[model samples]
Target chain A: HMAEAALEAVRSELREFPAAARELCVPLAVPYLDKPPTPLHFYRDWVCPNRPCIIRNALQHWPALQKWSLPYFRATVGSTEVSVAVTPDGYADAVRGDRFMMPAERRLPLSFVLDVLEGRAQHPGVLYVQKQCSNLPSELPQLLPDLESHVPWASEALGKMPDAVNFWLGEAAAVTSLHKDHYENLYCVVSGEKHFLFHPPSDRPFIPYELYTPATYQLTEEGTFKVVDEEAMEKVPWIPLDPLAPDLARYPSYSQAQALCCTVRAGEMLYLPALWFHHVQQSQGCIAVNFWYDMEYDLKYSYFQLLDSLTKASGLD
Target chain B: SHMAEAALEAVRSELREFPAAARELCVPLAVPYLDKPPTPLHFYRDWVCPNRPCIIRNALQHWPALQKWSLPYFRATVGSTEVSVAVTPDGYADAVRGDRFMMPAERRLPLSFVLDVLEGRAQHPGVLYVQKQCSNLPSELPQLLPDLESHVPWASEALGKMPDAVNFWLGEAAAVTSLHKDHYENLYCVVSGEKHFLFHPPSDRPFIPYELYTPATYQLTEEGTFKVVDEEAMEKVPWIPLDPLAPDLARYPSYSQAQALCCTVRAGEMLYLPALWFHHVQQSQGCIAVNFWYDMEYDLKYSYFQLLDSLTKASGLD
Candidate 1:
């Protein structure tokens, strides 16, 4: 009875943890700031506590907001080759079937990708320019002039240069799965709106995880999608449950996971704190650039790891 | 066996990770000094949230207490006023004695008599410490208010609230406070002599032993001996039994893993003791000091500690 009572107490706290976070610490949704903030104010209000905020008018100086149409991208780098993730469905880096499936990284011309994005041409799969390994400076250098190299205030607040500058442009069908990154992300939308679904770190207990074999999306010549398993690769853990339509029959604990959603329109940016699970969608041909700042593995991250271990050890996940 | 081992492993993991967090979150200070008061936002973001302790120098140079306060001055001013003093045979008050949690006898004595015991000019029953924590600076020593500010202005501004209590401390060298944690962020300023503090971050709670003991208080019997008087109807009190100074590793073996940070706060300096940090304190003979106790925000960190405490208790770690 003592052991059972103890486990029940931990279970009750793990359940109430997210409730207290949302009720006291985190706001209902992402709050809006009309103007820019000082570095100290930004760090104190958002970064230290690891909360998310959307700031408006901070990117007024970015030329991309006004000039980043498909025409401008084409004229600047029409024939340049860029990496794009091609998936049969919208999901990339998501769990499909019993395998953790990754998108096929295909190098395609700028104009050709733009053609598919603008609906001037048709493609077999959902094409997304989501190569996140510093894609801006590496592949699309011409787009640098349209947008600043990085978000200045965030870089100063975090006290380091961004590790990656990702340029995101995808169809409405192209979706990024619900997952977390190990970096502080400053995502700025230059052309269209981006819809983000968020889950705080406290929701780790309610979220479900499963280990699966690694695989990739392979498109054959006949335009059929096949998942090729990497037999030699180690198995990976992934979230099979989607927040939008969670399979409660298999993972009923997810019902307790509270989701906060926000939309980032053109000329605005979202400060996504590190380790927050997020799912993202966008309008057709929505253009966005995000700077990834390496996060500190400080006490906050350690606490999260402890929470993770307890969630698993307590058999609550 | 499996369930017990798994639960013990989870509790042990928390204990292991907390010290690692302290190293990452708390920067080691070798008597480091800050020249001036930091901006409220900088202080809040840098020291308050991280729960790290630091000494701020020159932030108290403007206080009249720096120049005006002395043993003679205090004797001339508030000598005849009756003050509450904790009397104990040894330096330990509110500490463990055998199987009981012993509380010191509280006696109302003249401030002059307390000073005499501290200064060795007169003999007393036991170690005399004017260590009342009930905002005693305001309640007992109002005459000294003009020498010091009502509150630390910058810290108050940073926390956005006034302090809950302003405690005054003047005691003998043998006077000691046992290892314990408080739910208040404390600012200790040594006005005259120096103070030595030993601290353990709250994460070390698992390694610290908490035992239940019957409650009792000291009574100075007619023969000049301390006698324990039980509070018969009161419930048992839980306390940390391992003495950090000379811990009995055989009985409370887990305390061997605990890490203690020791620092000295001399005159004209203030030590910011973060909330929930376990502290054992001692001071020089005739040491005069005042501390501001600000109520801590029961935020996420508080909740985390509560979870840890519950797990430790459930695991029967003690």
Candidate 2:
């Protein structure tokens, strides 16, 4: 997978921008992302298309999973990094270079790490992971890498759209700013957990670089994202991510936009189609893999589709 | 610093093959993209971007296990496959598989996978084993990451204001990845791999698309890009060596409109710039290193729709 590198990046202490245990304000917009799992079309009309949603059945494909089996960890073939991440205080090792000094983990599965990334394990063994060959789960779509590649989908479902490639990987309780993605992305949980919140891109005005040239193309960061939390989150410049930015004072629209959210788990997939906006906070110490894709569409009618405001308005349209 | 070759090869994935199946299918989409239709800018301008920084608390700190972990080398199993690149005497001459039995650098081991891989950990509710990282690496070059307030180069600084991270990974790709600019400013810092970046200034020529965001350039499938920068060949294409942001309007008709393209940072240095700069990313040999990206606090305000609106109003065309 092109995103293979991100697997390691999530754990990297490369750039330490810290925050809190539980996100304070932003509310859960898509509480029923995938409550009754499978048969996606059922939820299509029932769930909130405007915000992020999670389905429960998505993880049904995976049975019997426990991340903390200490004996198995101790049975490592070669040198392996043990439960160094689950220590008392969450932070980098004070003296990082000394491996021997690292603490071993206590063998309780859920006691440590989060579980968002579990969906990716095609072959879940005591060691090494492979792709699942059969038994496709319809709750969230299955992504095949390419026609040439056996992997069914390049990306899974998000808001009825199938996207590819890019993903957002953060720690348990980490938060993603209120923003929209270029393509529809299915935020899947691999290891840790998440609490997603969002707004509609259609309701927002996106920015681009002032210049017109391709090389000159870029979007502005300021005010590009706003928090839809019922109340403002405390400010911490160091952490840089807030539930209240553009300070409701400067951009009151954030309060008006109203954030959507929901908690997700391993196996379950979160759908985010193009034009949708969102924010996320992993339940923590979890390994989740969100799917990002600009689908090739592979079809025609959908290919030529454009906005003409041809449809009727409102919820049941 | 020896990985220009591989990076170029890896970038090919982004390159859209001309008249190909995907291209044929993409042609219509490309039409709207090329023509620049209506966008969500008006909404973005009024809604987001005016806000500073990525604002989603508990989100950033959510996924990762905060506890400090032990670093282990896992090139084969736990880590990505890497080639042992050297400098000078042992200079990058050979390519080796991950050697966990030998040196730690060659191995890719992390503590997260321990319970999963060795322990055969079961699925626990609530918490789960997060990331499994490769050990002891060449991390962020502080020398390169200058203080934003200092105004050393407000490029990467502008990006810092955004939420998404500017990440980097090492890969080996082939020719056809052409010289081009980016919507985001760039810097190709050479690390373990070597890539002879014959970087062309944005003002060099009317190049073809090679599949980056809003790409309109072509990638040269001509041989490999590893053979050190050829002075003569470099002169032929639109190339620059990271000087001041110069717009050679006359040479490349589109140059005047393009922003800056710089790789002038030293061999071991990083070329820092905000997004929307037109430039190309290439690699001559297999390489490894970091890529620093920060969000643009100001640019987020303007959405593509607004851009289309401006383009339509200015050109009076589509």
The fraction of correct interface contacts reproduced by each prediction comes to 0.21, 0.01
What lDDT score goes with residue B61 in model 1?
85
lDDT of each: 0.85, 0.28
Candidate 1: residue pairs that collide? none
Best by TM-score: 1
Model 1, span B1-318: residue lDDT tens: 568557646755664566556555554534355777777766776677777788888878878999988888889999998999999989789999999999999999899998787777899888889888999999988888888888899899777689999998999999999999999989899999999999887777778889899999999988899999999988999998888999999998878877788999999999999899899999998999999999987665676677667666665665
Tens digits of per-residue lDDT, candidate 2, A91-168, equal: 211111212111222222221222322333211112111111221122112222211111122222122343233323
DockQ of 1: 0.32
lDDT of 1 by residue, A203-255 (tens): 89898988989999898999878889999999998899889889999999899
Q: What is the Å distance of residue A105 in model 2 from its true position?
A: 23
| Cα distance off (Å), candidate 2, residue B56 | 48
* lDDT score of residue B116 within candidate 1: 81
List candidate 2 segments past 4 Å from native: A1-51, A63-174, A190-192, A206-241, A244-246, A296-317, B1-318
DockQ for candidate 2, C-alpha atoms: 0.01
- Residue A206, candidate 1: alpha-carbon lDDT: 93
